[PDB]
């Protein structure tokens, strides 16, 4: 077949019931995640090709960057709660990996302030139990799928994208191949 298990995707031995239809994991410490966001715009391009009725979920993981990794997962929860994902994703990536000006919770916070979220608004969300369960979800979802590396995408809790098995000669071709694969898996 033109799409094969073990080629453009793999199948989970233990499928995950009731999972988000398209589920992506990343870490702001993850170098390929940086590329996936900044250069490739994977998430956005997958979206452009998905059916209608399709929800995209994106979650942060703890297992990179120790204490600041965890801080980053709580902060991403805040971002989701407040609907400001598209205002902080880039400065967080560049703050961790490009400029290296994120070294503590307080620096993570500065990214939000500078992106226009209010001090009070941020600190309340950060401390809210809505945010705690959102952090819990992020952890649950990763734990559910035996996640030990990022970037990672899962379709209907049953298929895992395998970007290693696609041509990287040409970046645009890579994305389109990736996205068409998500759509195939979607329909499957």
Q: Tell me if the bond preceding 83 is cis, omega within 30° of 0.
A: no
Q: How far apart are CA 56 and CA 44, in angstroms?
A: 10
Q: Phi/psi at 153 (nearest 5 deg)?
A: -135, 140
Experimental method: X-ray
Q: How far apart are CA 120 and CA 115, in angstroms?
A: 14
Resolution (A): 2.3
User: Any idea what the CATH number is for the domain that residue 108 is in?
Assistant: 3.40.30.10
Q: Which residues span the domain enclosing 184?
A: 1-188
Q: Are strands 159-161 and 56-60 parallel, antiparallel or unpaired?
A: unpaired
Q: What is the chain written as a DSSP string? A: --S-BTTTEEE-SS--TT--SEEEEE-TT-HHHHHHHHTS-HHHHHHHHS-SS--EEEEE-SSSSHHHHHHHHHHHHHHHHHT-HHHHHHHHHIIIIIS----SHHHHHHHHHHTT--HHHHHHHHH-HHHHHHHHHHHHHHHHTT--SSSEEEETTTEEE-GGGS--SSHHHHHHHHHHHHHHHHH-
Query: Does residue 92 contact residue 57 with C-beta atoms inside 8 Å?
Result: no
Instruction: Count up the domains in the chain and report the number.
Output: 1
Q: How far apart are CA 147 and CA 130, in angstroms?
A: 24
Give the CA radius of gyration of the chain.
17
Query: Does residue 138 contact residue 80 with C-beta atoms inside 8 Å?
Result: no
Residues found in the chain: 188
Query: Does residue 120 contact residue 31 with C-beta atoms inside 8 Å?
Result: no
Q: How far apart are CA 119 and CA 151, in angstroms?
A: 31
């Amino acid at each position: 077949a033109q799409y094969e298990d073990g080629k453009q995707y793999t199948t989970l031995e233990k499928p995950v019931a009731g999972a988000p239809q398209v589920l992506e994991f990343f870490s702001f410490f993850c170098p390929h995640c940086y590329q996936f966001e900044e250069v490739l715009h994977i998430s956005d391009n997958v979206k452009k090709k998905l059916p209608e009725g399709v929800k995209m979920t994106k979650y942060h993981v703890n297992f990179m960057g120790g204490d600041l990794g965890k801080d980053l997962t709580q902060a991403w929860a805040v971002a989701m709660a407040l609907g400001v994902e598209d205002k902080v994703t880039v400065p967080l990536f560049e703050g961790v990996q490009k400029t290296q000006t994120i070294r503590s919770a307080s620096d993570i916070r500065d990214v939000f302030i500078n992106a226009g979220i209010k001090g009070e608004e941020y600190d309340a969300a950060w401390n809210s139990f809505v945010v705690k369960s959102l952090v819990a979800q992020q952890e649950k979802a990763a734990a559910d799928v035996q996640l030990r590396g990022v970037p990672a995408m899962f379709v209907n809790g049953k298929y895992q994208l395998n970007p290693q098995g696609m041509d990287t000669s040409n970046m645009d071709v890579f994305v389109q191949q990736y996205a068409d694969t998500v759509k195939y898996l979607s329909e499957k």
